[PDB]
Amino acid sequence: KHTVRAAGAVLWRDPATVEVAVIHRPRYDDWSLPKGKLDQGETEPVAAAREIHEETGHTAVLGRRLGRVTYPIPQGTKRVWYWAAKSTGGDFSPNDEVDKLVWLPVDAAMDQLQYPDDRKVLRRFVKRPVDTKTVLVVRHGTAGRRSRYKGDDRKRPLDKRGRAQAEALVAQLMAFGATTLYAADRVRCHQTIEPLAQELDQLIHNEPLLTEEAYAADHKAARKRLLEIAGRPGNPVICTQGKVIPGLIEWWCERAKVRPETTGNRKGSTWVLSLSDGELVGADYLSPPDEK
Ligand SMILES: Nc1ncnc2c1ncn2[C@@H]1O[C@H](COP(=O)(O)OP(=O)(O)OP(=O)(O)OP(=O)(O)OP(=O)(O)O)[C@@H](O)[C@H]1O
Ligand SMILES: Nc1ncnc2c1ncn2[C@@H]1O[C@H](COP(=O)(O)OP(=O)(O)OP(=O)(O)O)[C@@H](O)[C@H]1O
Ligand SMILES: [Mg+2]
Ligand SMILES: [Mg+2]
Ligand SMILES: [Mg+2]
């Protein structure tokens, strides 16, 4: 019943000209997709990027999530979440953990992979575009509790936990190649992405149209603004509030006929929206960095 959490990827370069990485491990004599266990304090996306680099030598940018694999192990259940990951270069060197890495077209990779579950992941990988741009919709971190004035507090800050969530989000949002930063017009929203701002040395663009009060007054202008931001060059992070996100995500998924595999709305959570030629092709809900 204990779950051992892991993450991994279909690491690719160049759908039918695309080549994917398949690795061999001497300890098991297996051919599989790179993956490994989450270290203490890591989220799945962070672990996937790190394990890909450790096992293949390549850096990469994560995109669409590709489902979950589980299997029994002595400790309980191994759980592995997989991402499409576009290679950003590197070099493989054989060692005792991983002695071979082959780059194969998807069909030949399917024959090389020995585990039925890995082939299922690869089938998902080719079902939709993989050369995707990414919009990251983040619910601000924990910020104590609303007071008893009507509606909303503009200046209420993140609390101690929430500041730590903000710090923990840097690596998770970097895993997806975030480049540009946007926050609703509330201090707690800005503070959630300020650590990332400092890392990227980027300014955060303030978004009055995306606060809870603005969404309730004019939802159409919020939707229009989301699309506007998404159309800009780069991979934007947009930090907003709990009454806003579910509505925005549902509306986009509905109109694009995209089915999210997970749903939630927790403070510090992230929706990874994958676009191909401006169309939504994936909506992946990630838990807060300090939650399961
Ligand atoms: N998709 C699948 N379905 C069913 N069984 C699968 C399987 N994949 C591997 N195994 C089988 O489970 C056992 C443990 O291997 P593993 O889960 O890959 O365990 P691991 O802990 O050795 O490897 P990772 O989770 O990849 O761990 P790290 O990279 O974090 O490990 P390291 O830190 O030792 O490099 C092996 O016999 C393997 O054939
Ligand atoms: N005084 C209030 N007026 C209206 N809604 C409230 C009030 N207090 C709580 N809520 C509701 O509870 C949710 C969470 O409130 P909480 O005080 O925990 O966090 P919050 O930091 O204001 O969250 P968010 O900015 O995402 O709305 C809010 O999103 C809102 O839907
Ligand atoms: Mg491994
Ligand atoms: Mg490993
Ligand atoms: Mg490891």
From Swiss-Prot:
Regulation of activity: Ap4A hydrolysis is inhibited by fluoride ions.
Residues where Mg(2+) 1 binds: 35, 55, 97
Residues annotated as binding substrate: 25-28, 30, 35-37, 71, 78, 97, 115
InterPro entries on file: His_Pase_superF_clade-1, His_PPase_superfam, Nudix_hydrolase, NUDIX_hydrolase-like_dom_sf, NUDIX_hydrolase_CS, NUDIX_hydrolase_dom
Pfam families xref list: His_Phos_1, NUDIX
Matching SMART domains: PGAM
Catalytic activity: 8-oxo-dGTP + H2O = 8-oxo-dGDP + phosphate + H(+); 8-oxo-GTP + H2O = 8-oxo-GDP + phosphate + H(+); 8-oxo-dGDP + H2O = 8-oxo-dGMP + phosphate + H(+); 8-oxo-GDP + H2O = 8-oxo-GMP + phosphate + H(+)
Domain notes: Contains an N-terminal Nudix hydrolase domain, followed by a linker region and a C-terminal histidine phosphatase domain. The C-terminal domain is necessary for efficient catalysis by the Nudix hydrolase domain.
Function of the protein: Catalyzes the conversion of 8-oxo-dGTP to 8-oxo-dGDP, and 8-oxo-GTP to 8-oxo-GDP. At high enzyme concentrations, can also catalyze the conversion of 8-oxo-dGDP to 8-oxo-dGMP, and 8-oxo-GDP to 8-oxo-GMP. In addition, catalyzes the hydrolysis of the diadenosine polyphosphates diadenosine hexaphosphate (Ap6A), diadenosine pentaphosphate (Ap5A) and diadenosine tetraphosphate (Ap4A).
Subunit structure: Forms head-to-tail homodimers.
Protein family membership: Belongs to the Nudix hydrolase family.
Protein name: 8-oxo-(d)GTP phosphatase
Species of origin: Mycolicibacterium smegmatis (strain ATCC 700084 / mc(2)155)
